Amino acid sequence: ADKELKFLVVDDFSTMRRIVRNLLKELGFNNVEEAEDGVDALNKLQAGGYGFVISDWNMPNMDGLELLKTIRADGAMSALPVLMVTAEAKKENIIAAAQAGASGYVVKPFTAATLEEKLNKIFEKLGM
Amino acid sequence: ARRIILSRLKAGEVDLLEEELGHLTTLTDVVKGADSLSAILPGDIAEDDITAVLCFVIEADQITFETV
Ligand SMILES: [Mn+2]
């Protein structure tokens, strides 16, 4: 995958955002931007040129499941990879994420190795 | 009841997909082969829902559902 792929990391906790950014840096991806909730993510995504979205689930104003559904119904970015980050594997949430078109989901806290496997699986599936 | 069959699994997927299926339901009559996995499903989850979750990892043509 293009190492300069532009990432949008979304989470309402700045600490979680910094963690994800460093993990991506550990994997060789440095073109990363941040957002604090779904609304703020839709606003930044407007600037264009994003290649991957890693999004938290629980956030105020607009949560991750709604951000996902919005990215997927938007013709200009409908195919954008979206990895869902959740605090617990729970049937209702996994199904919801899959059925709404999530590229994958990962349970926090996660390691750099788990993130790499998740990213690689998505890259393979999408032909990146 | 119904039976699910997973084929052409790569190393580690048999265990990983048993676990994923575990989060969505309770499997009976589990058969773990070298690159395959089959089991009987209670019927407490739509199959399309299983497929969508399993497709996070594998392809749709690797999943088969059938009446036992
Ligand atoms: Mn949150």
From Swiss-Prot, chain A:
Amino-acid positions noted as binding Mg(2+) in the UniProt annotation, renumbered to this chain: 11-12, 56, 58
Cofactor descriptive note: Binds 1 Mg(2+) ion per subunit.
Record protein name field: Chemotaxis protein CheY
GO biological process, one term: archaeal or bacterial-type flagellum-dependent cell motility
Modified residues (4-aspartylphosphate): 56
GO cellular component: cytoplasm
Gene3D superfamilies: 3.40.50.2300
Organism: Shigella flexneri
Main location: cytoplasm
Keyword terms: Acetylation, Chemotaxis, Cytoplasm, Flagellar rotation, Magnesium, Metal-binding, Phosphoprotein, Two-component regulatory system
GO molecular function list: metal ion binding
Sequence positions bearing N6-acetyllysine: 91, 108
InterPro entries per the UniProt record, alphabetical: CheY-like_superfamily (IPR011006), Sig_transdc_resp-reg_receiver (IPR001789), ST_Response_Regulator (IPR052048)
Record domain Response regulatory: where: 6-123
Post-translational changes noted in the entry: Phosphorylated by CheA or acetylated by acetyl-CoA synthetase, depending on which acetate metabolism pathway is available.
Function text: Involved in the transmission of sensory signals from the chemoreceptors to the flagellar motors. In its active (phosphorylated or acetylated) form, CheY exhibits enhanced binding to a switch component, FliM, at the flagellar motor which induces a change from counterclockwise to clockwise flagellar rotation.
Coiled-coil regions listed in the entry: none
Family matches, as PROSITE patterns: RESPONSE_REGULATORY
The UniProt record lists the keyword Phosphoprotein: yes
Curated annotation (Swiss-Prot), chain B:
Name this protein carries in UniProt: Chemotaxis protein CheA
Domain notes per entry: May have three functional domains: one for interaction with CheB and CheY, a second for regulating phosphorylation and controlling the stability of the protein, and a third for receiving input signals regulating CheA activity.
Subunit structure: An in vitro complex of CheW/CheA(L)/CheA(S) in a 1:1:1 ratio increases the autophosphorylation of CheA and is required for the binding of CheY, the phosphorylation substrate. This complex accounts for 10% of the total number of molecules.
Function recorded in the entry: Involved in the transmission of sensory signals from the chemoreceptors to the flagellar motors. CheA is autophosphorylated; it can transfer its phosphate group to either CheB or CheY.
Compartments in which it is found: Cytoplasm
